[model samples]
Target: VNSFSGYLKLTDNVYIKNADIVEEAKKVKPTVVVNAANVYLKHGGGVAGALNKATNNAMQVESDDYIATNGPLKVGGSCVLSGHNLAKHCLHVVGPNVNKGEDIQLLKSAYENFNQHEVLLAPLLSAGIFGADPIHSLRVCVDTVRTNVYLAVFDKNLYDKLVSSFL
Candidate 1:
């Protein structure tokens, strides 16, 4: 949950040694969501642009609308940091930095504000720019946020429960 050390980084942005994290994300069923924080032009020129190139090459198809973010929020808001050109939908979330508890609270607010139907793709803490230990990030996210199902991108399940209404 805390990935303060750089050792966690793999060749890829996500540091999971196996596909378990991705599998877990998929398993969250319809609302697989990823939390990408602190994305900007400095690190790899932003997440949205990186996702577009990677997806286009990996999926072998041009995506007109594959990314989205919330616009900047002065208070409890989310914004599209980058990659609007390729994003289908963008959401912006504003929260405290990695160390602060506000990040989790803001994330909860953002999630609650949106209406999700399918998988929600997110990056894990901009590859430890926030702190370290993706597990902690997932813990805070799940503990504070309210959703029917959320597939946290990098961390293994710190907390997962089926929404009783859906069951």
Candidate 2:
């Protein structure tokens, strides 16, 4: 899946396919795990952008109970702005180039709504944007919110800076 963003716990049986995400979660013990697929830019390709459809057959399975069998647990619809998770009731913000100050208000509103749910699930914050590292992207989201926002990144420097500044 290309532009997929959500809050997920590593220990929750997440199975990703071909997604070029940082393996930092290996250092920690999480309750939830998210298995992402390859991020593609083209349609019907095995990249991030091609994740518009939920491919259940080609995806990997982590736990037997990971995916609910009763019915479609998640639902997705088009939104004008920000990210919205129907199952978890969260907004997944996936802006490519947020003009620093202008994004604060929008992000703040998203955070406020996301926190209203029992459990908030979101992506690693801006994982799909080009030229933007995980830390820089995540910091912008975190800085705009009063609550906690989780993120994952490949850049060690940005990660360290965010850790020192936010946490």
Candidate 3:
């Protein structure tokens, strides 16, 4: 696996790696894991889909209740639920709808919304199906969060890009 690490202004740890999200999640055993989802918390595609399967669809149930009571979340908004797999907690963020050309700020906001846990595992929001540049999205994530961050990158191309851009 290709991995890189650095420190941010808040003295937080930031780690980026080209690895499988589920496998990385198991290795890191982060207290909280974030899934890139839409306002409806539909975990049917991309990273969300894989995360759903990994957690045995536990997030789906919580997401249903959250949406019912809170209404559809807007871009940058998120919800938290108890985890069922590698993580103890799961944070679902409403990311940009890339098909509609949603604003990139929403991507940064998603990372900012994290509650600053000691350890957090996350994907490059909006970088996959959402069509955002992986390097740009990762920068946003690293800049916004004030806690230890573990970024999981599954694509070899993206991993190379990340290494060239930051490492």
Clash count list over all predictions = 34, 30, 0
Off by over 4 Å in 1: 1-49, 55-71, 79-88, 99-119, 123-127, 150-167
Could you tell me the lDDT of residue 7 within candidate 1? 28
Worst 10-residue lDDT window for candidate 3 reads 2-11
Query: What does candidate 2's lDDT look like per residue over 1-167, in tens digits?
Result: 22234423322222112222323222222222122221111213222222223323222221112233322121111111111112211132223324232332333333343333323223443343423354454544454434333344434565455555543
Ranking of models by lDDT = 3, 1, 2
lDDT of 1 at 151: 35
- Between prediction 2 and prediction 3, the one with superior TM-score is 3
Task: After superposing candidate 2 on the true structure, give the runs of residues whose Cα lies further than 4 Å from its correct spot.
Answer: 1-91, 94-96, 99-104, 124-149
| Candidate with the larger TM-score of 1 and 3 | 3
Q: Write the per-residue lDDT of candidate 1 for residues 91-137, one digit (tens) a residue.
A: 43333455543444444454443334232444433224444354554
RMSD after CA superposition, every candidate? 11.4, 11.5, 3.9
Candidate 3 residues lying further than 4 Å off, grouped into runs, are: 1-12
Q: For each candidate, what TM-score against the reference?
A: 0.39, 0.35, 0.85
Candidate 1 total steric clashes: 34
